[PDB]
Subunit: 466 residues, 4 copies
Amino acid sequence: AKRIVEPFRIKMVEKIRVPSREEREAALKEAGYNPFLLPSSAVYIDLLTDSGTNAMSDHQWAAMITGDEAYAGSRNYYDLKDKAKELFNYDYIIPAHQGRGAENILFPVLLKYKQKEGKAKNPVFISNFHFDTTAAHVELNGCKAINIVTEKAFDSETYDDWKGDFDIKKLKENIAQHGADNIVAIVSTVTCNSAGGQPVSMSNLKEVYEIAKQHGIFVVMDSARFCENAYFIKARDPKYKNATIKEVIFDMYKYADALTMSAKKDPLLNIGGLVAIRDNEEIFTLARQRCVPMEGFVTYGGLAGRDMAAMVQGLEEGTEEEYLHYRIGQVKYLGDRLREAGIPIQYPTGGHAVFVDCKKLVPQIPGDQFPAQAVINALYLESGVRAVEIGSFLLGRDPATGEQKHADMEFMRLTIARRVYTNDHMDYIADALIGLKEKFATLKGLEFEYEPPVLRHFTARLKPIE
Amino acid sequence: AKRIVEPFRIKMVEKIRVPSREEREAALKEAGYNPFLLPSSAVYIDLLTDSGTNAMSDHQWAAMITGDEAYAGSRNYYDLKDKAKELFNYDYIIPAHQGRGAENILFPVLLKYKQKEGKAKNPVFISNFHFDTTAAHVELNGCKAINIVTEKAFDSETYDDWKGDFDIKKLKENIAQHGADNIVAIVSTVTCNSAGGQPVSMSNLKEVYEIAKQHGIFVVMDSARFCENAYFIKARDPKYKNATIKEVIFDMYKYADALTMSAKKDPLLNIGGLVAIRDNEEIFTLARQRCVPMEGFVTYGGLAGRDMAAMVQGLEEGTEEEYLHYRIGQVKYLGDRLREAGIPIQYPTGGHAVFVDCKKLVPQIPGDQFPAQAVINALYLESGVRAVEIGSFLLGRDPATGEQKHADMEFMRLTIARRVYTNDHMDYIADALIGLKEKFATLKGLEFEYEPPVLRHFTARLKPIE
Amino acid sequence: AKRIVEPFRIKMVEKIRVPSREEREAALKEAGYNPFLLPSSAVYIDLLTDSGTNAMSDHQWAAMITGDEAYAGSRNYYDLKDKAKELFNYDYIIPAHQGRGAENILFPVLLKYKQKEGKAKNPVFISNFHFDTTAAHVELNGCKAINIVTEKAFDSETYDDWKGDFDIKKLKENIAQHGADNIVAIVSTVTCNSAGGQPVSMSNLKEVYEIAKQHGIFVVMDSARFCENAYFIKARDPKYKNATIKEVIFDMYKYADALTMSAKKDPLLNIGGLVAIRDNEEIFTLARQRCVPMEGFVTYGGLAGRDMAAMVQGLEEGTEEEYLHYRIGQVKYLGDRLREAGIPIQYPTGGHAVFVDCKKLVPQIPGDQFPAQAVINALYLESGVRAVEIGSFLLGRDPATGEQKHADMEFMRLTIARRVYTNDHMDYIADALIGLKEKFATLKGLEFEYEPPVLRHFTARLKPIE
Amino acid sequence: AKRIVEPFRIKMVEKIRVPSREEREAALKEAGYNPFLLPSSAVYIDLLTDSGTNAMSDHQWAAMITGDEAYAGSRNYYDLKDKAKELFNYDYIIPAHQGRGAENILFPVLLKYKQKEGKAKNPVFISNFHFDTTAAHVELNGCKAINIVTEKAFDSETYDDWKGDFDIKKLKENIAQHGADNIVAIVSTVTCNSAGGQPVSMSNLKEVYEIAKQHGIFVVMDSARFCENAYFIKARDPKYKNATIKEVIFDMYKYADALTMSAKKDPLLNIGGLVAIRDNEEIFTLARQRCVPMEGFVTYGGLAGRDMAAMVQGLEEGTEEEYLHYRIGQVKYLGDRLREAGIPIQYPTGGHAVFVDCKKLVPQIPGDQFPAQAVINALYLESGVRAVEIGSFLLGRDPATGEQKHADMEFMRLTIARRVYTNDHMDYIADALIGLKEKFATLKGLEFEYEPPVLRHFTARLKPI
Ligand SMILES: CCSCC/C(=N\C=C1\C(COP(=O)(O)O)=CNC(C)=C1O)C(=O)O
Ligand SMILES: CCSCC/C(=N\C=C1\C(COP(=O)(O)O)=CNC(C)=C1O)C(=O)O
Ligand SMILES: CCSCC[C@H](/N=C/c1c(COP(=O)(O)O)cnc(C)c1O)C(=O)O
Ligand SMILES: CCSCC[C@H](/N=C/c1c(COP(=O)(O)O)cnc(C)c1O)C(=O)O
Ligand SMILES: [K+]
Ligand SMILES: [K+]
Ligand SMILES: [K+]
Ligand SMILES: [K+]
């Protein structure tokens, strides 16, 4: 395990504290054994998500101070539009308040556009792996979300360079089955969050886009972690060994038609989202027509002007290779600490989190009883670290049948905010989970007390089994 | 006209600039003669809206600096929930990114809830006046938006205390014609933005609420400008002559079942919304379930934690009587400057804006040629001040008819951001408008060029008559 | 009077409060009838000083955020050094924590440098008027502080373009009387604070410098309000009618060898000072050697790095003609209000304050009973406005025999912080003071309870003389 | 060597970068081989000082935003006055722009007050050790600055609990030789910076104070690093084993009559200083009379209001035991990395810095050829880290003679700002210096090329010899 020093020093700190065991126990049962329902005051180190918890730089706070709060035509909107042209070569932007705001703007528009000629009678979206809000927006619009990640992602301890890849064979199988007239869009998620933050190769992106263009299928790049994906391409694709990160990104986005981005991840924000379209002006116009009632006027999209200003600056800092090297290396450092102690993880670690394989850690719990959630709850009670489940709990049920969706992966996700915790916090996380080696065998699954019908895991309340 | 001293001093400034006449003429042509498409760099004083353009206090910025950016369970969420319980006596909150996000959370939930009871077969919403985004959500969900503002609102020059009131007789008539089963909700807009930011009396709110409870009709207070409404109730209802603003607010919210609020208005924010529900926990659960995919997790609703921090402080400052006296008095000052010179305005002035009655100012232009917009563009080229139309352009077209909705009013809205401009800025605005006295008789309408089917006035491009 | 509109808008506000008459009564009594000892919570509008109370721009706060806090070699030190070179064409800078820090750095260095030839045996400084701290550092170093402003400044009500000018005849007469070898330095105070903020013409500065170079005398420019002086030169000198402010400043500093500066005035700051030296490297070295033990290392001089950063931006904004026109026009507006009601003031008003001639306002109180303080207290008890005395109380005792220094002017200074108050605040001050006209004749003087030996007007406690 | 985790997380970052070797060479040549003259742009990790470079907390920045900028009577002045009453039990405060401003306010007052009785005809100040500016202000007012730190501070590698203590025998011996009438003040420096940030025990402070009240001698507590001293008292004195930091602080200040403080240290600021006085109103009145011409009005003292508000918050945060345990533990960690690799240091490490004994690292470099500055220069060229010298380059020239290289200690001070650098930055520093064991044999001394007659270290020039 190699500690990689920070390419920055600390400018402002925020106090954290360890609540007592009795605090955690009470807090956990008040939360219905769902850490999502814990107040942050009951949490020590928060690894629930890497979304919106990032530490910004002094340059980003300075851009916020001068942000233009105008309702129409803010200076920062044109800065953002120029930045998107520079980074992605895309000519149209619509800001959004966050990632799922951007999907709410763009996915219904693509559905209605697909349906112009009486097509898309049984519409589907295809992705390497739709994430929760992305899949929810697909199914909310009467569509069907189809995930075709390479099965190399299901073998956690076996190394592979691109565990986020599409399965090209499955892609052509699904185009054959559903027909090109039913494929509303192909969504390229970079990195692929559900597979463990794993990168997608340039040739995979290129091949998917080529196949999509042969059949006239629109391609949207889900871009929340595009910079981490770009680093992995440079690190592992020998054709880009000597390319800058911005060069890698520029090429990535030749293989999509639009992007939806949660700017709360790689652009180092606490809020903010973005739709960008390469050249299709009709889609842009219709998406502006939906942005207005749903998010806000087209030049702020539900963002304060200061947040668009932070986004312009963050979109630069997120691409800096020295920062990416440290950030991705801190995640690798945590994973190696765990792997060197026998804890099974998705190998190699992704860009933003360590995914602990709980199928192997607590095999006496079936997936329908949420084995990873039992490990998470145990970790919290022994240390105050809050982590999140990426398995059967999160996958939800099938909108057609109503039964549990088959989860090929039961992960506890140790999600790392950008520039927030040190390697010594990592050591704390590792040692607390490593110290649980004995308790794992005697952990009990969990049963629903209250299940919402869409995105259940966010607000569900659970009870142990026996 | 009377000038009221600020109950505060200036702590931070932002430069503004007057663009040369040539720049304003180029900019407007580029903007398709729709000032919504003008960049703020081409606007001197911006009166397009009082939403999100407010100046915050130093306590609000200090609150943002210590805002808890936790994804789930931010301590600012809990402070917000205590503040709603203090101000409104409501027990449930869901933050939203702004007002139209709050509406998207609550309104489809109220429709769907009524439909599951076998009701809302031909669903309508009834309001004193739905504002544009509010009515757009009503229509998007398949319902009709009915406005029943008191007829005194159309009598522009004639003073009345409560021009935002419901017409009780039309309330009963519509309940009779559509049936209580089809009324999805009554929306009490306070102040009534579309009537000229004019107040709704306490006795009107109370009688409306009593009528609704008789029929089992849910009542929603659209609370964007609730503090401005509360001040007017104190200024004009002798029953509250010696009450605090908070006591007036506490009584107002006895007469709704929930509220949707744009926190970008009276809470003095640049971004932010809120849903609060008095005590119906079922609606709260359903709205929480719709929040998660649309806005964000239920303890931040698409806001950064700093923005929830600003909101808690802003709701306290928004209610301070000496501030409101200054704020509403600045609006009155602007209105009095114009009324002195013979410009017909909605009288008395509302809380947030002067409404210049363009039916009486420029009678030669037909209602279907948007007379108020002709005045707006003329004001912009003359002074670099940007205003907004509240007439036929805004009303758009009638659903199911594709026809211009009947516009009882043609208004140019001089919208005043909170704590941003001085009374000397007000004199500039007034002087520029007065100077066009002789050119009012020689103005013409405009023709559509690109008309959006919903909320057309935002991105529509226009062209002069000749 | 004429109100000039702000060339900016408000971005952040700070609440102020009017304390009751009963509070003012108790507060002034506890403060030893000396408003310097009032807590700010007892003041509504604070006209005590324009020093360090200014409102900064968003750009200045953005600069503070990215300030370099390094102990040696802060990035902002080199920006400040380039700024001084651009504005003044001076090659050396030493930052200081404020104006009197700069004086404590430079004046002792100028004295010992003058002594190095066996000279300065009876040392004096000559100025148009030494400000209080300036004169105190002169006297504390064993030297005499000579003031020789134009007698036009004693003709309060009579207009003159240049009431801050040196009396040239007195300059030459003091040189002949004292000998050039005794004049440690000539201090050109621009604007002349003690005369009423009144400007020094460019030809007056040029002639003073030429006389000083004729005699080998070092010339320091006390530059706290150099930007207000530069404006007045462009307004009133036909040679500079079409120059830029920066061009005027560039020429002003041709007529000095160094400057001391409180950046708490015209650079729009809350803290900060500066020494800059044109090209005498020996003085620079000796001043650097004094800086280290008194102020701090020579690249921050007792300033945080953010404050140096704010100083670089402020030095630019303070020279903007549009801001200067408004700022100086705001002071003129308050003066004309008082001048129109028959209140005698120093006319024309200067850059930063209105000086009310209390010698004429309350002719019944002798100067040793400090008549201006009588007015000040009355204005405070009536309105919560706090002003300051610029008369015999401020002038103090002579260093020999403790005799009261004969004051030629007994002023009440209404000092206006930059970009902080509106013209409606100005209206409040004027109406308060205008409303006291029936009570001026029935006012008494004051006598000492505790007199500090140096700068008594700051901590002295007074008792009314009845 | 034990890494202690942060009791906080990062809210805001500032970017740094390692200048290429050529830039470091160019920078050092242009800086005249004096790192005090390097632009920070040429510096990676700055160890020049722990003064004014600290990272503030979000509560401190929020305090700054609501700061009351009023010239007289700022709300934050009254908050600061109530804070000093709470922490120290002292009744009077005067804010100051930084520590040496506080010294300029109070020390000349103390001499004048002692003179007005007919005493202090041959005036001296006595300290466990006067810091540099402190001693400079003493000597600028015609007095002699006497240092009488325990002799255990001179045995660099031998552990002692309290290497900052007063030598009590020398204290009594100096009171006997100079006379109580000539001792203007006793200055207790906590922690004792010039000894290596080494703590003073409570019983030592108490005994110094007792001897001084017998002889009528005023006692000033130089409090730049009083929190670190309180932590060490709690760590090493069993009587305070179960006391809180604030109780230890409350007890320390029973043994002084006044304090001067650089708030740029333990109160976690970038600027700021403070004078506080226990109960002597006359000394307070005289100090105010000096504050007004030197610093500013008595309710802001040359500080912006935002900085007084920060100081009120930082005074609270600087006493937090979990923070102090982390902060002092990180310095200990750096020292242990070096000590475990054979690098001689002042042991145990102080509260704010590791001090490296360079005479043992560069033997064939004598004192007048700047042995500690040679290591520092080599270290910067090799790593871009800037450290400071506490040896014969700082010591300067004998009066009317030559190099006062009577360097009792030839130290390189690796000074650690609070809450700024991680333990992985600590590793970089240690690995860089440890990596210099090979090139130590180059033994390249340093020779002047330009020199000032006074304050040479702050701005001199030299060349390798
Ligand atoms: C053509 C004017 S532009 C639109 C912004 C604005 N009004 C917003 C309101 C909203 C929506 O809230 P938001 O999503 O936060 O904008 C709900 N209810 C009411 C009464 C409002 O006034 C205004 O300027 O009048
Ligand atoms: C009633 C409060 S007097 C203190 C502020 C004050 N002027 C200060 C001046 C200084 C010293 O500068 P600082 O140490 O930064 O205060 C030097 N020269 C000149 C012309 C000045 O005016 C004022 O209010 O006029
Ligand atoms: C606490 C766990 S759920 C918080 C969501 C967060 N991911 C968000 C996300 C979005 C929506 O972006 P946004 O609407 O801004 O959240 C879209 N696409 C992808 C690939 C994403 O990963 C995450 O993985 O932790
Ligand atoms: C390279 C050394 S530069 C000096 C700055 C710093 N120490 C300052 C200090 C002061 C002056 O305080 P201030 O005037 O605020 O600096 C007073 N007393 C003590 C015990 C101090 O340690 C330090 O040790 O680096
Ligand atoms: K957040
Ligand atoms: K905004
Ligand atoms: K100030
Ligand atoms: K600093």
